[PDB]
Ligand binder design. Structure first.
Ligand SMILES: Nc1ncnc2c1ncn2[C@@H]1O[C@H](COP(=O)(O)OP(=O)(O)O)[C@@H](O)[C@H]1O
Ligand SMILES: Nc1ncnc2c1ncn2[C@@H]1O[C@H](COP(=O)(O)OP(=O)(O)O)[C@@H](O)[C@H]1O
Ligand SMILES: Nc1ncnc2c1ncn2[C@@H]1O[C@H](COP(=O)(O)OP(=O)(O)O)[C@@H](O)[C@H]1O
Ligand SMILES: [Mg+2]
Ligand SMILES: [Mg+2]
Ligand SMILES: [Mg+2]
Lengths: 373, 667, 373, 373
């Protein structure tokens, strides 16, 4: 009867899991699987062949860390099963065979990904029901709006979804394979100019922490670079795990600049502002005014200081001066997809949109293409 | 005359049938029943005629035929087997505490003393007076019983052609971890509370004792008083028994000094002081250490070093290595446990020497052993208990299969080799040397950074594919072992803390050089007798192996005492309680081993309407049985045919019943 | 069934033998073989051609003492057999053909040494099983840790082995051929400045006793030398076997100083502190903090007074001030390798790691390379 | 007027210097500086405090040899000045104050290295002009191609640079800190298995000579090891300077194997073949076919026998079977960087790309960041 649904926002970098109706995810941990890369010499020490989540980062210095998801696509289907098993049993401490599960996926992913998630849910974990949602719709659900264009940016992909009065325009949906992971790689590359070498996968986590703590978005790039070159007031220090101290200057704002200039990492694509403007201009002329004032930002990559100010400046430069530009960046936008999924999964009217086990048995794994979206 | 005595003669033996027959016997005030040669006794909580000389002469010898079941039948059967085979025999009285094993042992002792010697009864008087001392030193209050024996009493009555010589008492499978650790709503052994309650005041002032709530070794349970027990009266009775048993005032004073020393040693704490390269435990207050030293007549500095230091001693040097807080705690607990064990051994040795025998040619052994234990919260002690019970159930199943083979051979049939799956896999799962659970526990007790979680992970890794072993779904600190009595879940919470029982040579040397004679004698004897057993589990396994090795030179006889109701109501019975007791006592293992016997006349007279309309053959025999057999198109390999009995009924019974109801469906 | 294993820690200078499960070695004696060098004139006196162990030091004044092991490598394979026979029969009073044997070896020795030990054990003494362990792992076993870097120093070699959570990093293993024997030789050399001449091998033992009794490590070398030169309060006397009394001053702390300045004996290598720091810096950045606080010292050469204080001072000078430096020097570190071997050989799970006689018969002496380490 | 430019290819291990327009370097000598480590007893003998180049290897047995460059980064700025002074005056016999100088550097070095080289050239040696080039571009210049991916491997670093029609893709540039020096260290480590001990810096040169003369690359590792173990036909002898003869077997091909399996020396990086394939796959899909057939190998570490065959085999295994794989390994690839620099510095159109002294005076040492690359 009272079977609480499970909301699992398995992103490329973080797993956000919890119960429907809650205000925050119950379990948040990195989506990594680690394996030992050294020689075990003590008897009985070395009987574990895999580490998932936070225990993979506690043992970070002897493991090889691998991500099962790149750019929103699950490429390793055994590590993904390990991560899902960890989430269901060790983290949520719940039995999946008695809870409906709600999962999320990027708008323009291959269909085999969704079919394989459906098969794994219905055959390995024996869930009673299933649904796969689109992350931007859940961002709107969490934002308390029915009209707006969502710029979601995790660390796999960046996509734009314009929605008006609950109606989506699929032809105006954008997608970029440029997100937090590429920012971490670019910061790792440009940290070599000061003589800092981060090579292994365990140092990728240190570089990611540096990026989260120190990096920010400059309102204007050229004068910021001139100020950084003409003085030393923009430099900050960071302490490495072994006690060494590093210092970074213009690398603080040069790393997030690749979101607006993808040419830094050798991509021909346009910036996030131009992508958003292009997505808006692909909609009806009667929809554009409402979309201009409902720019909803979601994801962890949108958490840089000053990113909303620059997005508003760029859109104002692009859009006509008559329109009013608003960038909605709630302080909890890092969990907006999960919050929206929790809101949606707790609705009583939503109970008729689940993919039940009987429907799967009847129609194969392809039922998810007509039941979802 | 509706009930039956021996259920072996029954044609269909099922759990429901056994329960129905047992409750029918109990409702007629018939306590004792027979399973082949295995007796079953239900405690009635009421005085019954289980005594009287007329019963003795009625059961004297083989003149009765064992038509009525009684313990005297077990006694005279053991006597007859001894006189036939010229070999010793043992009688194993198992069962839960309060199920009636104690008075069963006393009645057996009285019957043997009455029928063997019948001229002198001094042996039974001398061995009965030692019972209160053992009961006070070996029982404790648990969450299931208010007086439970935590050890196995081994009484050996020596006989020389009907002449009762001296008796030897031995103890086995004593719980070492209860001396220093007790769970919620349970106490330590009764002796400490009796000593603290009934001691004379000036003795308490001399020993600086206080109320039981202050001591750490006793207050862990939180309920130091039993509602319905008088400690002072029992303590005075124990004094009377010691005075009868020749224990002088000096010996009693020494025993009280040892117990007070254990109690005071239980109240020593340590602090984490900072050293140049480690954390070192130091005693908080030296009052307790000095009190223990004064009570035991040993050096105070020697005791403090034996508690807070580790000695690496080769020929050319002797190095002192400071211990941690946990290591010091383990050392103190090990000292307390070894002191208690040595004291109990000394008491039993003195009691045996008081009634020492002369020759050793024949002997009757009586074992009063505790049975299966399945509580709500389940831990290491019950794991050892269930391991011992599994090793006893091995012999029980061996005896049952021997009786089954004897039944098969006695009937005029070509005796085949009957399949039988013993409980060896469970014993291997628990205590096999390569990767047994207890072996993993012993390995983790010396590994550098081992805790309970690592031990659980090792157990899960090594035994994940065992059918008997089962893991919890959620990451709970527990595991499940499928015993003969069902699935039992063990909570791994202090398995490593309860297993550390290592006492080093420095402590033994300190205790040998004492100013009192009894303690020095005990520790000198222990050092002379002492071994790679440094843990509680290893010593328990060694003691159990000794007990088993004492028990293959004879054919055991089993007495299974049950319990009809937990409220001790004399007459009230429950079916679920009977099922639980039958599962725990191993009686249903006989039913499991059986899988099926029917007389040839019964089914001929019953199922005659399945093939023909009414086939009333006047001449019965094996030929008509075979005719009715292959007229039904049934393979001969799934059943067997003899004279009348041993007609195997694996699956033919179900199909025969189905055909009978199908035939009777029309009319 | 209950076949107790034998632990034999045959070092360059001392043999440490005993039974698994004990708290101390049963037999400890020098690893020397002596032969007469004079003329026997009494009939019947002089029928013994070799003396092994303590009996070689009782007759020290008529014998030529030779060591079968230099720098952890067995160079004399008949004297080694004599020593092993002595250990098994005259010292332990046990029959080797019914006891598994555990032996130790330096981390970076030639493979022929290990193969020859295996062949001698399996063909001359007919042991039922065998294992060869690494001494630093046994030091960690005795120390009750799974993470730490071990500085073992006997009198043949000095090596560093960093281990984290039971995983060894073989690329960070160091080795120095500078140990107690070199210290004895250097003390013998610098004792000639006061006119004391020790030449023969029998006087090497006297110099070794002097070094063990009087030598210590100075916290700082230069001010210690200044104090020793400006006064005479650091001088101590020693009595020779024939009654002569010698006095030594700055030689007390100049001898152990070659551990931190190998240039005194003409070596280009770095001190033990710099070697330990270099070994730490070759590990992962996430391992260094735990290693800095788990510096385990083992062996007889680490028994000098004040050596741990100077090691901590030097590592603190080298390592960043943020990290916390701990030097673990247990009072029984002279027997830590044997204690760890005894702990390891008594484990029930270790019974599957022995090299059985059948495996040797099948695979030749080369089985030890894949079965051990 | 006719001021001939100087090309100085100062690598981590060798200095390759000469005049622009020549076909071969004029001066080639090791990049080492030696200092005495013993006691001078003869009057007048011991007045030299430093030895640079070949004279540092003639006196190898009394000196401490140090390299001013590790992994392509100059760490000692006084020894580097000594080496440059030696090159300009004692080797080339030319006055640097009247010749433009062309220098080389690894693609992803710290900027301070380049700025310091510029400052030293313009302030200490007073050169009239300067340029800093990338070694892979010079390798392509020497190879006579404009399209191709270059695998340069000296003894400091290994890097990949894909270039198409004279256009470089900086985002696909790889770098490994695994090269000849690490191979020498690994060979020194694995030579201890046969009992050969090389400790000092002077024996590092002997080990390097052994590696150059005897080591080779096996086409397949496992069957080569099986053949070496099953026979003794792969063993070769080497004569040490004092007459001792050493013999090595599988160490001949186990040393260069760490280029394809960096895990032997405890690195998590991928082999050179996988690094090259990854660099190719980071380029445009229309560039990959031309790059697959223009794999240019340069440097001294690429001089092992059979390295090109194994590189082709590995790339063929990785790349699709449709493509055609070509490995270009010219016999003079040890000097390809210098040859390309000589070709580039002699061009008449290149005279406008020099960094003149006036530009340096105007713009400080930071002019090199915008004038070069
Ligand atoms: N405060 C922050 N500043 C900058 N980047 C951040 C911050 N917090 C998270 N990130 C980046 O966002 C990415 C994770 O965001 P998330 O939305 O959880 O990704 P996904 O949904 O794909 O798992 C990581 O790469 C992380 O480095
Ligand atoms: N107290 C001490 N002070 C200084 N040196 C010592 C001391 N004890 C032993 N040694 C030295 O340590 C060496 C022996 O240590 P040990 O660890 O037994 O060597 P190995 O393991 O190689 O046999 C000898 O050279 C001895 O002189
Ligand atoms: N024939 C050869 N075989 C193997 N290795 C070689 C050979 N020739 C040179 N090397 C190695 O290549 C390295 C020097 O190459 P080079 O390209 O001059 O380095 P760099 O450019 O960094 O100075 C040295 O480590 C040397 O041992
Ligand atoms: Mg997301
Ligand atoms: Mg040693
Ligand atoms: Mg080069």
């Amino acid at each position: 009867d009272e079977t609480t649904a499970l909301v699992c926002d398995n992103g490329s970098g973080l797993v956000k899991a919890g119960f429907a109706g809650d205000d925050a995810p119950r379990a948040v941990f990195p989506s990594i699987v680690g394996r030992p890369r050294h020689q075990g010499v003590m008897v009985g020490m070395g009987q574990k062949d895999s580490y998932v989540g936070d225990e993979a980062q506690s043992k970070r210095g002897i493991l090889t860390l691998k991500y099962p998801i790149e750019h929103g696509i699950i490429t390793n289907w055994d590590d993904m099963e390990k991560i899902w098993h960890h989430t269901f049993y060790n983290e949520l401490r719940v039995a999946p065979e008695e809870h409906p599960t709600l999962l999320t996926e990027a708008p323009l992913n291959p269909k085999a990904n969704r079919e394989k998630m459906t098969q794994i849910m219905f055959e390995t974990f024996n869930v009673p029901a299933m649904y796969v949602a689109i992350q931007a719709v859940l961002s709107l659900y969490a934002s308390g709006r029915t009209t707006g264009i969502v710029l979601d940016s995790g660390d796999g992909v960046t996509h734009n979804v314009p929605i008006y009065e609950g109606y989506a325009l699929p032809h105006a949906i954008m997608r970029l394979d440029l997100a937090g992971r590429d920012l971490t790689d670019y910061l790792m590359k440009i940290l070599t100019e000061r003589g800092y070498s981060f090579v292994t996968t365990a140092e990728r986590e240190i570089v990611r922490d540096i990026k989260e703590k120190l990096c920010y978005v400059a309102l204007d790039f050229e004068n910021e670079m001139a100020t950084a070159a003409s003085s030393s007031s923009l430099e900050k220090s960071y302490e490495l795990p072994d006690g060494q101290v590093i210092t970074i200057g213009n690398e603080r704002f040069r790393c997030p600049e690749t979101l607006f200039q993808p040419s830094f990492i050798g991509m021909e694509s346009a910036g996030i502002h131009e992508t958003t403007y292009n997505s808006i201009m692909k909609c009806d002329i009667d929809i554009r005014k409402d979309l201009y004032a409902n720019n909803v930002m979601s994801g962890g990559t949108t958490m840089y200081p000053g990113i909303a100010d620059r997005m508003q400046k760029e859109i104002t430069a692009l859009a006509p001066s008559t329109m009013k530009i608003k960038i909605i960046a709630p302080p909890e936008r890092k969990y907006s997809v999960w919050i929206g999924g929790s809101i949606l999964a707790s609705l009583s009217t939503f109970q008729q949109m689940w993919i039940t086990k009987q429907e799967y048995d009847e129609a194969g794994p392809s039922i998810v293409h007509r039941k979802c979206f | 005359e509706d009930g039956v005595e021996d259920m072996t003669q029954l044609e269909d033996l099922q759990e429901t049938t056994v329960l129905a027959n047992l409750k029918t016997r109990f409702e007629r005030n018939l306590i004792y029943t027979y399973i082949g040669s295995i007796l079953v006794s239900v405690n009635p909580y009421r005085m019954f005629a289980i005594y009287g000389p007329e019963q003795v002469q009625q059961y004297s010898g083989r003149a009765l035929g064992e038509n009525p079941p009684h313990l005297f039948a077990i006694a005279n059967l053991a006597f007859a087997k001894m006189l036939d085979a010229k070999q010793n025999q043992c009688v194993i009285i198992s069962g839960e505490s309060g199920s009636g094993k104690t008075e069963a042992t006393k009645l057996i002792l009285r019957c043997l003393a009455a029928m063997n010697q019948r001229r002198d009864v001094m042996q039974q008087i001398k061995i009965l007076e030692a019972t209160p001392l053992l009961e006070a030193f070996g029982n404790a209050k648990t969450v299931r019983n208010d007086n439970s024996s935590r050890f196995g009493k081994f009484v050996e009555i020596f006989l020389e052609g009907g002449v009762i010589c001296g008796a030897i008492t031995s103890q086995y499978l004593l719980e070492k971890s209860r001396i220093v650790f007790q769970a919620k709503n349970e106490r330590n052994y009764h002796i400490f509370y009796e000593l603290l309650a009934g001691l004379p005041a000036q003795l308490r002032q001399a020993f600086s004792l206080q109320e039981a709530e202050t001591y750490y070794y006793l207050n862990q349970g939180g309920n130091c008083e039993i509602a319905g027990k008088s400690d002072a009266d029992d303590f005075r009775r124990l004094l009377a028994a010691m005075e009868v048993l020749g224990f002088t005032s000096e010996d009693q004073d020494s025993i009280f000094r040892i117990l007070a020393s254990i109690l005071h040693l239980g109240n020593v704490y340590f602090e984490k002081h900072e050293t140049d390269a480690q954390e070192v435990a130091s005693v908080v207050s030296a009052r307790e250490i000095q009190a223990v030293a004064e009570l035991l007549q040993v050096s105070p500095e020697g005791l403090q070093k034996a508690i807070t230091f580790k000695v690496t001693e080769t020929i050319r040097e002797k190095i002192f290595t400071p211990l941690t807080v946990e290591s010091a705690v383990d050392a103190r607990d090990a000292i307390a446990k070894v002191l208690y064990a040595l004291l109990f051994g000394w008491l039993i040795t003195r009691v045996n020497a008081l009634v020492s025998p002369k020759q050793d040619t024949l002997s009757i052994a009586i074992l009063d052993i505790y049975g299966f234990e399945d509580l709500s919260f389940n831990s290491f002690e019950q794991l050892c208990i269930n391991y011992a019970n599994e090793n006893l159930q091995y012999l029980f199943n061996k005896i049952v299969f021997q009786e089954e083979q004897e039944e098969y051979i006695r009937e005029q049939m070509d005796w085949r080799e009957i399949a039988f799956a013993d409980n060896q896999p469970c014993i291997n799962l628990i205590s096999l040397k390569p990767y047994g659970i207890l072996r993993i526990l012993d390995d983790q007790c010396c590994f550098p950074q081992a805790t309970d979680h690592t031990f659980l992970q090792k157990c899960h890794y090594h035994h994940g594919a065992n059918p008997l072993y089962s893991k919890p779904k959620m990451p709970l600190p527990e595991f499940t072992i499928k015993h003969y009595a069902g699935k039992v879940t063990y909570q791994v919470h202090k398995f490593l803390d309860k297993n550390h029982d290592q006492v080093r040579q420095d402590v033994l040397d300190l205790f040998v050089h004492s100013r009192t004679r009894v303690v020095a004698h005990l520790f000198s004897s222990h050092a002379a007798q002492t071994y790679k057993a440094h843990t509680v589990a290893a010593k328990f396994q060694q003691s159990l192996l000794d007990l088993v090795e004492k028990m293959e030179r004879c054919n055991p006889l089993f007495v299974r005492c049950l319990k009809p109701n937990h409220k001790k109501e004399p007459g009230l019975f429950e079916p679920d309680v009977m099922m639980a007791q039958l599962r725990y006592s191993g009686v249903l293992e006989t039913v499991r081993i059986r899988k099926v016997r029917l007389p040839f006349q019964v089914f001929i007279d019953r199922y005659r309407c399945l093939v023909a309309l009414k086939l009333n053959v006047p001449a019965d025999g094996d030929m008509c049985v075979s005719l009715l057999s292959r007229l039904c198109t049934v393979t001969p390999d799934m059943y067997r045919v003899g004279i009348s009995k041993l007609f195997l009924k694996e699956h033919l019974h179900q199909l025969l019943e189905s055909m009978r109801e199908r035939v009777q469906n029309r009319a």
